[PDB]
Design an enzyme around this catalytic site. Structure first.
Site: not given
Ligand SMILES: NS(=O)(=O)c1ccc(C(=O)NCCCOCCCCOCCCNc2cccc3c2C(=O)N([C@@H]2CCC(=O)NC2=O)C3=O)cc1
Ligand SMILES: [Zn+2]
Length: 257
Positions: A61, A91, A93, A103, A116, A195
């Protein structure tokens, strides 16, 4: 999965991430005439003199320069922020042409690109816990326009050939983010979101008014990157920006009179 094309681009993200239609999504258009000067804002402190870059990565991305954030080395504080925020990655955009790419927009003006610099609130221990909090993150946004070259960016540009496609990554130590900053730290600030998906609403946005200038050759090298992995049909990594979102019930503050 999610991307920037017709069938998986921003207008589709809300299906997997319904927060995409939430109350504090980013980016936004910055109406400079309705943003209000806030005298209660402390000076902004960008302390990057001991930043430690580690690696550069093409994630399909954008490309991320990731930093060692295991100690307090490159910190953002002051301005709208309570306490200390630690740099984790930066990073960009950018567009397919110089007339688009940013953005955030300024009175609807789109810049050629936007940098950003991503920081997490050290009261929450690390990035993963910080993105569970409404004040977990602070992103410093810097606009890029095409003109004179930015010398401090060339080391990034010259390494892109080594990470052309999704999943590729390379060593990238001793990069100094101070070479990416404009002269002025005048800024606008507002509460918003990531974003890109998961679009989590945990960001204090700090968007600098003064853009940096980069050369056409530099941004053209950005546009030689690929969204796809090696051995897939080539999709150039361009226009990886989300459009401006509804401001809803939010106020943008200016740091300058
Ligand atoms: N452009 S910018 O703005 O500057 C900018 C933009 C972006 C960034 C950036 O950091 N991006 C990276 C993002 C980091 O965040 C990640 C947070 C993740 C949170 O946790 C997710 C957990 C998921 N689990 C779940 C949740 C609910 C329900 C279930 C389940 C799950 O597994 N199951 C089953 C279980 C078992 C299996 O076997 N099957 C299944 O289906 C579920 O029922 C930085 C700057
Ligand atoms: Zn960004």
């Amino acid at each position: 999965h999610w991307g920037y094309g017709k069938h998986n681009g921003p207008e589709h993200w809300h299906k997997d991430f319904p927060i995409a239609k939430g109350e504090r999504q980013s980016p936004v258009d910055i109406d400079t005439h309705t943003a209000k000067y806030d005298p209660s804002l402390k000076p902004l402190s960008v302390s990057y003199d001991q930043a430690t870059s580690l690696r550069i990565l093409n994630n399909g991305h954008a490309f991320n320069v990731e930093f060692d954030d295991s100690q307090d080395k490159a910190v953002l504080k002051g301005g709208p922020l309570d306490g200390t925020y630690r740099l984790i990655q930066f990073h960009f955009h950018w567009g397919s042409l110089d007339g688009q790419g940013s953005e955030h927009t300024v009175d609807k003006k789109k810049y050629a690109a936007e940098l950003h610099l991503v920081h997490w609130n050290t009261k929450y221990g690390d990035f993963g816990k910080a993105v569970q909090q409404p004040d977990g993150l602070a992103v410093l946004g810097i606009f890029l326009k095409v003109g004179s070259a930015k010398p401090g960016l060339q080391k990034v540009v010259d390494v892109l050939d080594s990470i052309k496609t999704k999943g590729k990554s390379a060593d990238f130590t001793n990069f100094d983010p101070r070479g990416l900053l404009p002269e002025s730290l005048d800024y606008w600030t507002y509460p918003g979101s990531l974003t890109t998906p998961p679009l989590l609403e945990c960001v204090t946005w700090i968007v600098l008014k003064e853009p940096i200038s980069v050369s056409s050759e530099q941004v053209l090298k950005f546009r030689k990157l690929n969204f796809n992995g090696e051995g897939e049909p080539e999709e150039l990594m361009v226009d990886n920006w989300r459009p401006a979102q509804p401001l809803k019930n939010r106020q943008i503050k200016a740091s300058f009179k």
